[PDB]
Amino acid sequence: ETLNGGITDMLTELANFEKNVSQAIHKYNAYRKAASVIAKYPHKIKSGAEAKKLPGVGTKIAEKIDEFLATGKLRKLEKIRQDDTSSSINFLTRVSGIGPSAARKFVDEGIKTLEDLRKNEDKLNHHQRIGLKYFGDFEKRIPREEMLQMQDIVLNEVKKVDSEYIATVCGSFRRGAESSGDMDVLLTHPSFTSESTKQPKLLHQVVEQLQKVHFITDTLSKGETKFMGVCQLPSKNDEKEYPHRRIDIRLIPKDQYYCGVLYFTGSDIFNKNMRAHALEKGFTINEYTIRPLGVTGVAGEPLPVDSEKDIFDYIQWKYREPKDRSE
DNA sequence: CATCTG
DNA sequence: CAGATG
Ligand code: NA
Ligand code: NA
C-alpha cells in the first residue's frame, strides 16, 4: 500500500501505454497482474530478483524494477512522457465518445489537439460532438448543492408523469459524497419486472418530460432501457449559467431494483465485503439478485426483495445507512 | 452490458 | 454484423 508503491505505479504506466498507444493487450494485461501482485506483497521489494520470485513476474518486468530501484527513473517511461503521439493519444481520449481506437485514427490523421478536433468536427460522431462541445463542463465535478437541486427536479417530474415511478439517485451522491462526477439515476415501475414483457415507454416517457421542462440538453444514447445524456440547472436569473452535466437514466424491472439499487451505490468495497459475507451466510449477490446458495457446489433461485433492508436481512447483517457504506 | 456506427 | 464506447 506504500511499500511497493512506485513499483506498482510505473507498472501501471507501462500497463497503460501498452493498451492505449500500442495495442499490446497481452503486454498490458501483463503489468496489470504484476502490479496487482507486487501490490499484495508484504515486503519491501529490494530487487528484481526478489520480485521475479513472484507470479506474473518475469524477466522483463524484473529487469524494469531493477532499473527503477537502481536509478530514480525508467528510460522507457521517460521516453513515453515525451512522445507527443503517446501524449496525444492520452489527450484525445479525454473526450467523451473518444476511445483510444478512435484516438489513434485521429492522430494518424494528424488531429491531435482540441483545435484539431474542432476543425474536423465533421469527422466526429454525434456523441463525439457533444463531448467536444462540453469538454470543460464535463471535466467539472458536480457539487451537492447542484446535486440535491437536480435530484429534486428529476424526482419531481417523474412524479408528475406517473405515481408508480421509483427514481433513485444512487452513486457516491447516495453515500453522502461532497461532489459527484455525474448523475446516476435508477429507475423502476411496478408494471415492470423479470417476466413482464417489455415496456420501453416506461423509460421513454420520463425522458421526454425532462427535455420537456428542459432539464435535459442532449441525447448520448437512448435505448429501450438506458438513456445517456446531458442536463442543466436552469440558470435562475441570468449572470451565472450551469455546467452541463452527465446524466444517466436506467430502467430496471421492479423485481430486481434494490440490488441494483444496493449495488449502484457501492462502494465497490462495501460490495465485495457484503458480497464476501453473503457467501458466508450461504447466499449470492450480484447486481440483479440474491440467491440461496445450495451446497452442491452452487445453486440458486430468486429471493424476494422489498428493500435494501430485505437484502442485508438475508445475509443476517447490520442495516447500514448509505452513508456508512464506505467500506 | 447496452447502444451506436458504419 | 464486428467492434467501439461508456
Ligand atoms: Na474518452
Ligand atoms: Na476477431
Whole-angstrom distance, CA of residue A312 vs CA of residue A70: 50
By the 8 A CB rule, do A93 and A105 touch? no
Strand order in the sheet with A226-231: A166-168, A183-188, A245-251, A226-231, A216-222
Tell me the three cell numbers of residue A262: 444496493
What residue has its CA nearest to the C1' of B5? A125
Binding residues of A for Mg(2+): 182, 184, 248
Residue entry with cell 440458486: A300
Q: What is the 3-state secondary structure (H, E, C) of chain A?
A: CCCCHHHHHHHHHHHHHHHHCCCCHHHHHHHHHHHHHHHHCCCCCCCHHHHHCCCCCCHHHHHHHHHHHHCCCCHHHHHHCCCHHHHHHHHHHCCCCCCHHHHHHHHHCCCCCHHHHHHCCCCCCHHHHHHHHCHHHHHCCEEHHHHHHHHHHHHHHHHHHCCCCEEECCCHHHCCCCEECCEEEEEECCCCCCCCCCCCHHHHHHHHHHHHHCCEEEEEEECCCEEEEEECCCCCCCCCCCCCEEEEEEECCHHHHHHHHHHHHCCHHHHHHHHHHHHHCCEEEECCEEEECCCCCCCCCCCCCCCHHHHHHHCCCCCCCHHHHCC
Specify whether A226 is catalytic: no
Whole-angstrom distance, CA of residue A299 vs CA of residue A286: 14
Identity at A100, one-letter amino acid code = P
Whole-angstrom distance, CA of residue A294 vs CA of residue A127: 46
Whole-angstrom distance, CA of residue A312 vs CA of residue A325: 12
Residues pairing with A189 in the sheet: none
As a rounded value in angstroms, the CA-to-C1' distance for A49 and B1 is 42
Q: Is A129 exposed, middle or buried (0-12, 13-18, 19+ CB in 10 A)?
A: middle
Instruction: Give the nucleotide at minimum CA-to-C1' distance from A93.
Output: C5
Q: Of the listed A19, A60, A64, A140, which one is catalytic?
A: A64
Q: Show me where chain A is broken: residue before each gap, C-N > 2.5 A.
A: none
Report, in angstroms and rounded to the nearest whole number, the Rg of chain A calculated over CA atoms.
24
List bases, strand C, within 7 Å of protein CB.
3-6
Kindly provide the resolution of this structure in angstroms, with one decimal: 3.1
Find how far residue A296's CA is from the centre of its chain: 35
Task: List the domains of chain A with CATH numbers.
Answer: 1-83 (1.10.150.110), 84-140 (1.10.150.20), 141-263 (3.30.460.10), 264-326 (3.30.210.10)
Q: CA neighbours within 13 Å on the CB side: how many for A65? A: 29
- Expt. technique: X-ray
Find how far residue A249's CA is from the centre of its chain: 14
Alpha carbon of A106 to ligand 2 centroid (Å): 23
Alpha carbon of A56 to ligand 2 centroid (Å): 26
